[PDB]
């Protein structure tokens, strides 16, 4: 604690992942506190920056002509702050597609408006980002159960549309979470729940899968693991810090020029899996990027 | 023969004492950058703030066509450097000012050409 204040945020410690806990209500000590952001900086710009600052510390395949898709990109201000950061963070020439349920203005290469379930793409993707949050989640009516809707879409999209070696970051909260998505984290070389230092007073975290392996290396119970996450958040107060926002010197994503290779699922071996896990390899087709959004007529 | 002129519309709205367009996206950067007007990555220097291009484009923000046969937008997808003193109205600035072709800086701000 407070040593972390100089970090972009705090990741859920491995020991907490290995527990088996019962889901309790999340009560944060720092609830109501606010970090002091630089003059004129939006919370969501600060938030996305720290997320990227953390992602810089992981092993991410960063191929030429990288493909990145961003769900829940629009704000109530009608702009896309998070997309702008991703744009800044990603290597120039990276294809960035973003989407939201509501209309917004974006700096992305292409933007799709509508429910995420209406979104289809031909090709696969190197990096997937989701800030999607259901405003109705704020209703505490029932108990806390695994959630569906866009969460169901994301799990499917990951399995079908994510390249091997690819990585994801999916925003969750106490009440906005899904069990299969946790289970799906075991299909990655590594995974964590990351909490930004600026938003540390919130149950918000990003589920980060690292280097998608397409098959489970680890078996995970989604209900148990989410209970583990809440337990971690409950017993570990995080000090709100805007500190890391002030050094942007090393911020840009280093371009690894990671290799891209098209293989059948039978050609994949422990030597290949090794390369994937180290973020030295991407497996997908190199074709052009084609997306679409289904429109209902009535 | 009719086309709406938004450029004039906003300028007069401003001159009328109207509140400038807000929620332009300001980027975190080093402020050691080259200071050029429109760039691929935030280039702001000590005197500048860097913004996301699309949020500073009047035509983008107002959901209207862009003024050119191609309808091309030279802001969106890029970043724009606004002098810190003018940063309360980035849209107004980009509208009223002009980028020097040879040195790539703002004409009247940082252009020695
Ligand atoms: N349920 C549900 C859904 C909720 N969203 C979007 O998620 C966003 C959560 S706030 C995002 C803040 C933004 N990243 C920023 O930079 O400020 C909203 O724009 C909402 O429209 C959806 N989009 C697509 N399909 C859906 N099913 C939903
Ligand atoms: Zn525009
Ligand atoms: Zn000049």
Q: Cβ(A17)–Cβ(A228) under 8 Å?
A: yes
Residue owning tokens 């963070």: A89
Structure-determination technique: X-ray
* Annotated binding-site ranges of B for Zn(2+): 57, 60, 66, 73, 100, 103, 111, 113
Q: Which residues of B touch A88 (CB under 8 A)?
A: 27, 29, 41-42, 79
Q: Residue A37 half-sphere exposure, CB side, CA atoms within 13 Å?
A: 19
* Cα Rg, chain B, nearest whole Å: 14
Q: Do B28 and A84 lie within an 8 Å CB cutoff?
A: no
Q: What is the DSSP letter of A15?
A: H
Q: Locate A200 and state its tokens.
A: 């540390």
Å from CA of A80 to ligand 2 middle: 14
Domain ranges of chain A: 1-298
Distance (Å, whole) CA A72 – CA A132: 4
Distance (Å, whole) CA A225 – CA A198: 24
Q: Locate B29 and state its tokens.
A: 């950067």
- For A34, list phi and psi in degrees, rounded to 5: -140, 135
- For B112, list phi and psi in degrees, rounded to 5: -95, 0
Q: Do B76 and A105 lie within an 8 Å CB cutoff?
A: yes
Burial (Cβ within 10 Å: 0-12, 13-18, ≥19) of residue A170: buried
CA distance B30 to chain A (A): 6
């Amino acid at each position: 604690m407070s040593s972390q204040a100089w970090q972009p945020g705090v990741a859920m410690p491995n020991l907490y992942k290995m527990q088996r806990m019962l889901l309790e209500k999340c009560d944060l000590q720092n609830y109501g506190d606010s970090a002091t952001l630089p003059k004129g900086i939006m919370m969501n710009v600060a938030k996305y920056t720290q997320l990227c600052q953390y992602l810089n510390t992981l092993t991410l395949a960063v191929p030429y002509n990288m493909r990145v898709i961003h769900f829940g990109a629009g704000s109530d201000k009608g702009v896309a702050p998070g997309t702008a950061v991703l744009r800044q963070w990603l290597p120039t020439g990276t294809l960035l597609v973003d989407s939201d349920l509501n209309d917004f203005v974006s700096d992305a290469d292409s933007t799709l408006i509508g429910d995420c379930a209406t979104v289809h793409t031909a090709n696969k993707w190197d990096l997937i980002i989701s800030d999607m949050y259901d405003p109705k989640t704020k209703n505490v009516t029932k108990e806390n159960d695994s959630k569906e809707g866009f969460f169901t879409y994301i799990c499917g999209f990951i399995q079908q549309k994510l390249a091997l070696g690819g990585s994801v970051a999916i925003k969750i909260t106490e009440h906005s979470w899904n069990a299969d998505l946790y289970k799906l984290m075991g299909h990655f070389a590594w995974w964590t729940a990351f909490v930004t230092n600026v938003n540390a007073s919130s149950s918000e975290a990003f589920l980060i899968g690292c280097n998608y392996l397409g098959k489970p290396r680890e078996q995970i119970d989604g209900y148990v693991m989410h209970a583990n996450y809440i337990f971690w958040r409950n017993t570990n107060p995080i000090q709100l810090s805007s500190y890391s926002l002030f050094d942007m010197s090393k911020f840009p994503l280093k371009l690894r020029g990671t290799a891209v290779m098209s293989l059948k699922e039978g050609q994949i071996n422990d030597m290949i899996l090794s390369l994937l896990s180290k973020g030295r390899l991407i497996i997908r087709e190199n074709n052009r990027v084609v997306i679409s959004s289904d429109v209902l007529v009535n | 023969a009719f086309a709406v002129d938004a450029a004039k519309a906003y300028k007069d709205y401003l001159a009328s004492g109207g509140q400038p367009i807000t929620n332009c996206v300001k980027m975190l950067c080093t402020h050691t950058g080259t200071g050029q007007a429109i760039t691929v990555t935030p280039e702001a220097n000590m005197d500048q703030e860097s913004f996301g291009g699309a949020s500073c484009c009047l035509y983008c923000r107002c959901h209207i066509d862009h003024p050119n046969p191609k309808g091309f937008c030279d802001l969106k997808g890029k970043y724009v450097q606004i002098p810190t003193t003018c940063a309360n109205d980035p849209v107004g600035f980009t509208l009223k000012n002009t980028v020097c072709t040879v040195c790539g800086m703002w004409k009247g701000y940082g252009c020695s050409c």
